[PDB]
Write a protein that binds this ligand. Sequence first.
Ligand SMILES: COc1ccc2c(CCN)c[nH]c2c1
Ligand SMILES: [Ca+2]
Length: 223
Amino acid sequence: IVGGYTCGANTVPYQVSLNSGYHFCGGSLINSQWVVSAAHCYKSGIQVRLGEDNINVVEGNEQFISASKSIVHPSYNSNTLNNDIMLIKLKSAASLNSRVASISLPTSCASAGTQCLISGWGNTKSSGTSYPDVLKCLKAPILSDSSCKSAYPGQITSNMFCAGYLEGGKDSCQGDSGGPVVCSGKLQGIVSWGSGCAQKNKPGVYTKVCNYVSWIKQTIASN
Ligand SMILES: COc1ccc2c(CCN)c[nH]c2c1
Ligand SMILES: [Ca+2]
């Protein structure tokens, strides 16, 4: 997160870290046994880390649970990033409490101008590299589809939206991939892609979760 703020320990209790020996992506807990992330975060040997604030210090609220199955969306296209969404099933159910909580799926799509919360442990610099050890937060509005398509001509599908600031300076970044975009208490986006971080006229692009609710619900009822 570039230009954000320190969230505060366990104030984003649905945020997860995906760990393969080191943090490599974020995700969101949607119930006691399932995590949503980006399909471009797929890999084998994933351990899901819940209840994290400092990812380098055991602070006492964490739960570490291995993944038992990963399901990339059937129409994911890694070249265009269309359908950049994946489900991860935990080997055992998480224990839900004040520090580890699920986020609800949306019933309708969020509208332009709505302010949302994006979080993650990714790079905090738009030029150079500095990686924080504590969770960072950013408030950003959903941008109109016409501004989004003008920023990324020929590249925005119906399954994407832009959020952020056309002036730059505030954005998600490398290492925030797969993390949540939450608006009005619902999961509306997944950190997906962009042209760099926090550059002028190049806002972040996010997977439009409201288009996937039926697939999510059907998949978790049968696996
Ligand atoms: C390798 O550099 C990057 C830079 C930025 C991003 C993002 C979000 C950009 N808003 C997702 N993956 C990335 C990879
Ligand atoms: Ca920790």
